[PDB]
Design an enzyme around this catalytic site. Structure first.
Site, mmCIF file in Angstrom:
data_model
loop_
_atom_site.group_PDB
_atom_site.id
_atom_site.type_symbol
_atom_site.label_atom_id
_atom_site.label_comp_id
_atom_site.label_asym_id
_atom_site.label_seq_id
_atom_site.Cartn_x
_atom_site.Cartn_y
_atom_site.Cartn_z
ATOM 1 N N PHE A 1 -5.463 5.701 -1.590
ATOM 2 C CA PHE A 1 -4.652 4.510 -1.388
ATOM 3 C C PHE A 1 -4.333 3.871 -2.731
ATOM 4 C CE2 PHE A 1 -6.236 4.416 3.080
ATOM 5 C CZ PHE A 1 -5.003 4.360 3.689
ATOM 6 N N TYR B 1 -10.317 7.337 10.070
ATOM 7 C CA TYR B 1 -9.921 7.710 11.422
ATOM 8 C C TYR B 1 -10.972 8.555 12.129
ATOM 9 C CZ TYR B 1 -5.190 5.887 10.924
ATOM 10 O OH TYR B 1 -4.101 5.061 10.779
ATOM 11 N N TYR C 1 0.825 -1.198 0.000
ATOM 12 C CA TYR C 1 0.000 0.000 0.000
ATOM 13 C C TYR C 1 0.862 1.252 0.000
ATOM 14 C CZ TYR C 1 0.999 1.084 4.878
ATOM 15 O OH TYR C 1 1.622 1.425 6.056
ATOM 16 N N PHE D 1 1.766 10.526 3.097
ATOM 17 C CA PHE D 1 2.126 10.334 4.497
ATOM 18 C C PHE D 1 2.653 8.942 4.801
ATOM 19 C CE2 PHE D 1 -1.557 7.793 5.722
ATOM 20 C CZ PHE D 1 -2.442 8.076 4.704
ATOM 21 N N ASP D 2 2.103 7.904 4.178
ATOM 22 C CA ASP D 2 2.507 6.532 4.449
ATOM 23 C C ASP D 2 2.682 5.769 3.146
ATOM 24 O OD1 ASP D 2 3.187 4.185 5.649
ATOM 25 O OD2 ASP D 2 1.232 3.797 6.565
ATOM 26 N N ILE E 1 -8.327 0.489 9.282
ATOM 27 C CA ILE E 1 -9.481 1.256 8.830
ATOM 28 C C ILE E 1 -10.419 0.324 8.076
ATOM 29 C CG2 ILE E 1 -10.229 3.007 7.191
ATOM 30 C CD1 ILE E 1 -6.882 3.496 8.776
#
Ligand SMILES: O=C1CN(/N=C\c2ccc(-c3ccc([N+](=O)[O-])cc3)o2)C(=O)N1
Lengths: 134, 883, 107
Positions: free
Chosen positions: C99, C82, C26, C36-37, C56
């Site tokens: 994503f 979130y 991912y 961010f990730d 999530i």
């Protein structure tokens, strides 16, 4: 040997100056002051190729010995007692590339030859510095 | 709010020399094709992504520089609006992702074919996946130059161009009326694959510094002859018309029969019966009028350009006779050429000099007539299709046709004189990094020149201006090479011009404060003076190596570090006390060069012009930022380009008694710009710009503003998605002037506001309380600076006004965070004023992508491959959307 | 709920039925293009588990509506996310999430 003899003499220097003006010689078109030093400055580099950059230390104190008004025999004996005091600074980076460049020559270690070339270079260099500040 | 870091790949681009633009001069057919076959691509070679695209471009700013740019790192096709691209699913132009649908939705996968079509006179670009069309087209470019069919990739790609015209034909049939892309090769030039805007090439000895290139424009293929309407051809010149026409026609017939042409009804030289073997009183009329008017226009321009003819003699013309011909000129039907004698006279060398001028004019007239008839250039001759491989006006022809035209016009001039009738842009300044400056020592580096031209090599202080000419100031001592000029605040001759392939040294002795140069194997001397060519320059703050490259040139600056590979430092150099510049450096020296990307930078204090003073507001006056010209006595005037220092994002991506019930729930901002007396309102443009604006034009107006639209339609219409985009939305101050004002200098102030709706992205303008008619619609998540461009014509030019209107929040309300509910103007120090700097420094990346370009053959097309990755640590400035 | 738009064809008949631990890779980026990730930085797959969420739920159903080799661009709304509080210091509250989930299914 001619250039130093011109420097190490009083009549030699004045005669050349008295000759150019009297004969109205150009002494500038051929160069395209103006004296024997012009040839020396144009031939010092080729004569300096045998300086053996590891001997750059030797050329340092040799000039000062000539500043002592010592004869050729005196400096030759002076350098003959400092054979151990060669460069031997191969670890430094200043002489690191110089050694490689010397070893890369397309051309060709007797101490008698070593002392002869350093003294010959010193005599030319020392008197040149004497006239380098007119 | 803070600087961000990440890892980004490198991107490149390769184009063929198939420049395809058109303005009005048969520069292209109008409908052109493009084929790309992608064999295999490896997804996520490195662990970021894989980038592979095809599309078109434009020779008006498409300069993708490796490394930084716009957005998060890479900038390929899909950058600022000069380029249009289409990946597997989406389709981006101007750095915004527009998703479009297609049968079998998928990214560009291994073993696929992509088709592209460009259509003009109704500007459009149409894409096609293999066997299926795409649901999206372009409609509204701003065509100003030629187009490159380009591809872009990051790493691990295998693509092949399929331009066609060979045994490797297209994988699909082109739509009718579309050129097969093998044309527009610009003869006297082959078809190669080259990168776009290169500045570093891999030559045999390593790196080669490459200067700016030189390419044609849209207004270059137009045939432009001399004005030939009112010259008044005299009857004395009218009496020769027919004789000259007959002579040139019979010489044409002689040249044709040189190939064996005979008299018959039909062309196709295999039959060898093209009718061209009759006298000037026996051709068919359609050719007769053209031939007679061709001779007429030759004489017409002959009289027009000057060289007033005079009655040299008439007895010689009367007594001039014909010339005998051998049996090879008699042909089957019976025609025989009648060549008039030409060895009797010889032309002046000046006459031979202007022999080519009227040849140029005649070929230009031929091209103009042919384009008026409706023919366009093609690489392959096709008479039925009205395509001819000789329609380039004069300068892009081949030497064979040029010499043929020269021969024809020279023989015409021979005949005429035989009967008496006597006839009477930027440059690149490469530089070592500021961290390598040395203030005391003895150094030398060897510059190498390959192509002769305007280059400059020398030393410069660290604070060197990248816009002024090298050596024109006191910050750089440099040596020119085209004419041998010392170039410290002057052009005094020094030395001799160089040649191709030689080297030029640059030698510095800061202990004795001198700079001495040297030519190939020798030390050059000034005109009259001795060596030590700069005479005790000041130490200052050290010196740095600097190279200058002109237009269309290459260089091979060698900063030591390879003393074994140096071509010198043995004949000269080491005999004196000197060392190579980078003798002890494990890492090769990284360089900084001058980039021609016009960036926005804050105005510098103590500037010679454009004084800006911040003003605080009053009870009746809001805070103001003013621009005041400080040297309107004799100084120059230039079209300034200014904007505010902070963004204004459009959210929701998913008397004067202010009432708190509404002012606390509104999303409108008003900031107005006020013009001053004396300044012409016709030279003020007020509006908004986006972070991807880079235009810098001396004749900038609303017409030359970048604008591209996209219509994500469907097969059965579905024009629902027809949004447009631009990097500059504004109004022209000339439209806000009453019709009775023109004819005199204005003495009042016109204030133009700016109204936007962040909730819905709606924009409107008002002037002196009167609503306007123009408006713009902007997509959400868009940053829009408050900008204004003005050409000054007064001592006081403009004055920003961060005012607040009734139930409308001021700019500072959304300019920051804490002031979201404050109904009062504010001018914090961050909101400075910046102008458009023309050029700025940049850092040359240490490495570069290795892309292999080759011709795979006559069937597979041209091969482009890349197999190695490359990453760079980006530092994205967030409020400017650039890294 | 979530958007299940695809980027790659992949293969279809490899749906995760229940219980089995699926392997996905991912890359997660916020709005405005900010990222961010991304597991590609760590070179380690997430090793997604079904049932015991620990994740999530929007991401869970987005991965569930996927198969072998089918890269999915998820558009998780800030409802199955979130929530109104968000991840402190990383994900600001009330923001959609993008994503780039690619399922390898190493089980
Ligand atoms: O391109 C063509 C056209 N054409 N045949 C048609 C015509 C009509 C006039 C000319 C014509 C061209 C050139 C010159 N000249 O060079 O003075 C003189 C006359 O050709 C043909 O066989 N090649």
């Amino acid at each position: 040997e001619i250039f130093i003899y011109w420097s190490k003499s009083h009549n030699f220097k004045r005669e050349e100056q008295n000759f150019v003006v009297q004969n109205e010689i150009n002494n500038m078109s051929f160069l395209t002051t103006s004296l024997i030093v012009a040839t020396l400055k144009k031939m010092l580099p080729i004569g300096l190729n045998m300086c053996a950059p590891t001997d750059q230390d030797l050329i340092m104190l040799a000039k000062t010995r000539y500043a002592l008004k010592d004869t050729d025999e005196e400096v030759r004996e002076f350098l003959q007692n400092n054979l151990h005091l060669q460069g031997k600074v191969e670890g430094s980076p200043s002489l690191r590339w110089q050694m490689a460049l010397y070893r890369g020559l397309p051309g060709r270690d007797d101490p008698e030859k070593i002392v002869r070339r350093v003294q010959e270079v010193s005599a030319v260099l020392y008197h040149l510095e004497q006239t380098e500040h007119p | 709010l803070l600087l961000q870091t990440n890892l980004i790949n490198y991107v490149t681009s390769i184009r063929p020399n198939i420049f395809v633009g058109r303005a009005e001069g048969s520069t292209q057919y109008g409908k052109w094709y493009f084929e790309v076959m992608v064999d295999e691509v490896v997804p996520f070679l490195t662990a970021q992504a894989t980038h592979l695209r095809v599309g078109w471009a434009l020779t008006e700013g498409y300069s993708p520089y490796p490394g930084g740019g716009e957005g998060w790192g890479g900038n390929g096709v899909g950058d600022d609006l000069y380029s249009y691209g289409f990946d597997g699913l989406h389709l981006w132009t101007g750095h915004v992702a527009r998703p479009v649908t297609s049968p079998g939705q998928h990214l560009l996968a291994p073993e696929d074919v992509v088709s592209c079509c460009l259509d003009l006179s109704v500007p459009s670009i149409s894409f096609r996946i293999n066997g299926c069309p795409v649901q999206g087209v372009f409609e509204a470019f701003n065509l100003d130059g030629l187009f490159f069919p380009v591809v872009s990739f990051s790493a691990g790609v295998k693509v092949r161009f399929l331009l066609g015209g060979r045994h490797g034909e297209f994988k699909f049939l082109p739509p009718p009326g579309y050129a097969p892309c093998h044309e527009a090769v610009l003869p006297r030039e082959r078809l190669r694959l080259e990168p776009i805007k290169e500045y570093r090439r891999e030559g045999p000895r390593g790196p080669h510094l490459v200067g700016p290139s030189r390419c044609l424009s849209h207004t270059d293929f137009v045939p432009c002859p001399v004005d030939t309407v009112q010259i008044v051809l005299p009857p004395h010149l009218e009496r020769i018309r027919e004789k000259l026409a007959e002579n040139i026609h019979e010489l044409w017939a002689l040249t044709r029969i040189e190939q064996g042409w005979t008299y018959g009804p039909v062309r196709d030289d295999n039959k060898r019966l093209h009718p061209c073997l009759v006298n000037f009183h026996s051709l068919p009329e359609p050719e007769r009028n053209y031939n007679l008017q061709m001779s007429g226009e030759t004489l017409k321009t002959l009289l027009a350009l000057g060289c007033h003819v005079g009655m040299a003699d008439e007895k010689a013309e009367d007594n001039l006779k014909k010339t005998k011909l051998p049996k090879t000129y008699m042909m089957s039907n019976g025609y025989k050429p009648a060549p008039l004698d030409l060895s009797h006279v010889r032309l002046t060398p000046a006459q031979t000099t202007l022999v080519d001028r009227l040849a140029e004019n005649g070929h230009n007239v031929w091209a103009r007539d042919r384009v008026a008839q409706g023919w366009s250039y093609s690489a392959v001759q096709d008479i039925p299709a009205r395509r001819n491989p000789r329609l380039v006006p004069y300068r892009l022809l081949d030497e064979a046709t040029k010499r043929s035209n020269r021969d024809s016009l020279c023989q015409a001039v021979r005949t005429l004189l035989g009967y008496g009738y006597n006839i009477e842009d930027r440059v690149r300044i490469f530089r070592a990094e500021k961290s390598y400056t040395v203030q005391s020592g003895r150094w030398y580096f060897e510059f190498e020149a390959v192509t002769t031209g305007e280059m400059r090599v020398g030393w410069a202080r660290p604070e060197l201006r990248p816009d002024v000419e090298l050596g024109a100031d006191e910050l750089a001592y440099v040596f020119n090479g085209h004419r041998g000029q010392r170039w410290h605040l002057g052009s005094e001759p020094f030395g001799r011009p160089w040649q191709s392939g030689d080297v030029v040294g640059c030698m510095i002795d800061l202990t004795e404060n001198t700079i001495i140069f040297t030519l190939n194997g020798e030390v050059l001397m000034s005109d009259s003076g001795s060596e030590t060519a700069f005479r005790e320059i000041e130490i200052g703050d050290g010196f740095l190596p600097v190279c200058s490259l002109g237009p269309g040139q290459v260089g091979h600056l060698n900063l030591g570090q390879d003393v074994s590979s140096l071509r010198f430092f043995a004949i000269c150099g080491l005999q004196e006390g000197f060392e190579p510049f980078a003798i002890n450096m494990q890492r090769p020296v990284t360089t900084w060069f001058s980039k021609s990307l016009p960036q926005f930078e804050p105005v510098p204090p103590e500037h010679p012009h454009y004084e800006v003073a911040r003003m605080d507001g009053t009870v009746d006056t809001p805070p103001c930022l003013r621009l005041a010209h400080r040297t309107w006595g004799s100084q120059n005037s230039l079209v300034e380009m200014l904007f505010l220092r902070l963004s204004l994002p459009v959210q929701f991506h998913q008397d004067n008694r202010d009432d708190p019930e509404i002012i606390l729930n509104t999303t409108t901002y008003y900031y107005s710009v006020r013009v001053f007396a004396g300044q012409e309102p016709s030279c003020v443009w007020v509006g908004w710009v986006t972070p991807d604006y880079h235009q810098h034009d001396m004749n900038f107006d609303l017409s030359k503003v970048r604008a591209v639209t996209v219509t994500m339609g469907d097969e059965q219409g579905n024009v629902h998605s027809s949004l447009k985009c631009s990097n500059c939305y504004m109004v022209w101050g000339g439209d806000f002037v009453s019709p009775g004002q023109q004819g005199r200098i204005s003495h009042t102030d016109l204030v133009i506001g700016c109204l936007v709706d962040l909730a819905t992205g709606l924009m409107t303008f008002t002037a002196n309380g009167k609503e306007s008619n123009t408006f713009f619609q902007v997509e959400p998540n868009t940053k829009l600076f408050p900008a204004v461009f003005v050409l000054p014509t007064h001592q006081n030019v403009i004055q920003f006004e961060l005012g607040k209107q009734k139930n409308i929040m001021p700019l500072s309300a959304a300019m920051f965070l804490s002031e979201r509910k404050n109904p009062a103007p504010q001018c914090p120090p961050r909101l400075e004023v910046q102008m458009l700097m023309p050029v700025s420094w940049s850092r040359m990346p240490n490495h570069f992508l290795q892309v292999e370009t080759r011709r795979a053959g006559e069937r597979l097309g041209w091969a482009v491959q890349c197999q190695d990755p490359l990453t760079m640590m980006a530092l994205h400035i967030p409020e400017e959307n650039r890294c | 709920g979530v958007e299940i738009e695809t980027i790659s064809p992949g293969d279809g008949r490899t749906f995760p039925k229940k219980g089995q631990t699926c392997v996905v890779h991912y890359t997660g980026m916020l709005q405005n293009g900010k990222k961010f990730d991304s597991s590609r930085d760590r070179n380690k797959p997430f090793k997604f588990r079904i049932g015991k969420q620990e994740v999530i739920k929007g991401f869970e159903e987005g991965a569930a509506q996927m198969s072998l080799g089918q890269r999915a661009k998820l558009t998780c709304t800030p409802d199955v996310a979130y929530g109104a509080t968000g991840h402190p210091g990383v994900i600001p509250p009330n923001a959609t999430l993008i994503f780039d989930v690619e399922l390898l299914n190493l089980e």
